[PDB]
Design a protein around this ligand. Structure first.
Ligand SMILES: c1ccc2c(c1)c1c(n2CCc2nnn[nH]2)CCCCCC1
Length: 134
């Protein structure tokens, strides 16, 4: 009955494109790129009141963030960046901006048909990662 109902659930990665190049653009080093690129995460999205929780569970790393839309928080990313994050809803798309070291990357999550599509963008480089219900 609310703001992210169609995102809530357990999702499994089924395809990726350009993720190595995205990670290079971000600054991720060779060994982490190789092991992270192999991961097939489950993304678990839940909502309790105003608080949204997004977990990512994989052989590479298990991460968890909780947040309120529009309210900045500090995040340690799976690749060990210490970033300041703000997540908003823009026309039904969750938009996640991460700022660190004068740099920025944006991760968009959208529902398309029965998929949850994640678009990671750093400068001119996009990676598209497609999730199915688990
Ligand atoms: C496996 C799954 C998910 C991951 C990662 C690794 C990494 C991130 N995300 C979250 C964004 C996301 N969600 N689905 N794919 N990407 C941080 C940005 C990219 C650097 C590598 C580490």
């Amino acid at each position: 009955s609310h703001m992210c109902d169609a995102f809530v659930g357990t999702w499994k990665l089924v395809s990726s494109e350009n993720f190595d190049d995205y990670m290079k653009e971000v600054g991720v080093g060779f060994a982490t790129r190789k092991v992270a690129g192999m991961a097939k995460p489950n993304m678990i999205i839940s909502v309790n009141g105003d608080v949204i929780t997004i977990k990512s569970e994989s052989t590479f790393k298990n991460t968890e963030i909780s947040f309120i839309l529009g309210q900045e928080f500090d995040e340690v990313t799976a690749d060990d960046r210490k970033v300041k994050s703000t997540i908003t809803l823009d026309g039904g798309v969750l938009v996640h901006v991460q700022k660190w070291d004068g740099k920025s990357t944006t991760i968009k999550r959208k529902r398309e048909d029965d998929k949850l599509v994640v678009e990671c963008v750093m400068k001119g480089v996009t990676s598209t990662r497609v999730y199915e219900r688990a």
